[PDB]
Amino acid sequence: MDEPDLKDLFITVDEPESHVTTIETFITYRIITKTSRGEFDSSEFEVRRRYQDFLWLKGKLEEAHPTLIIPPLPEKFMVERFNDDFIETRRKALHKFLNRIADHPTLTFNEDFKIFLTAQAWE
């Protein structure tokens, strides 16, 4: 039998880090998602995502909800990408983006949003 849930999500976006792979360096953001303000009987996942991962998500949401305007993620086309203002501006925008999806009555239940918030979870 089911335990009824209010379908609340609380999302933070923080701790930007440089991810240096062998072929590319890019910034990632820590996304922590909680389903409750309580200590017990709840879900909490921590993942790390780059901006391209958010663009993937936006596209999936657009495809699934073609009559909606999905919350925007503007970008203007080698130093600035690692600039403190650039990163902090983006962090705030990504937090706003994820909150808008989380609060939206159809977008919040999208399967790719769920995968986005949970895949490759960190301890």
From Swiss-Prot:
Residue span(s) of domain PX: 7-123
Location(s), subcellular: Early endosome membrane
Upper classification of the organism: Eukaryota, Metazoa, Chordata, Craniata, Vertebrata
Its biological purpose: Involved in the regulation of endocytosis and in several stages of intracellular trafficking. Together with SNX4, involved in autophagosome assembly by regulating trafficking and recycling of phospholipid scramblase ATG9A.
Name of the featured protein: Sorting nexin-7
Shown residues in whole-protein numbering: 25 to 150 of 387
Binding site for a 1,2-diacyl-sn-glycero-3-phospho-(1D-myo-inositol-3-phosphate): R50, Q52, R90
Subunit: Heterodimer; heterodimerizes with SNX4.
Similarity field: Belongs to the sorting nexin family.
Domain of life according to the entry: Eukaryota
Annotated signal sequence range: none
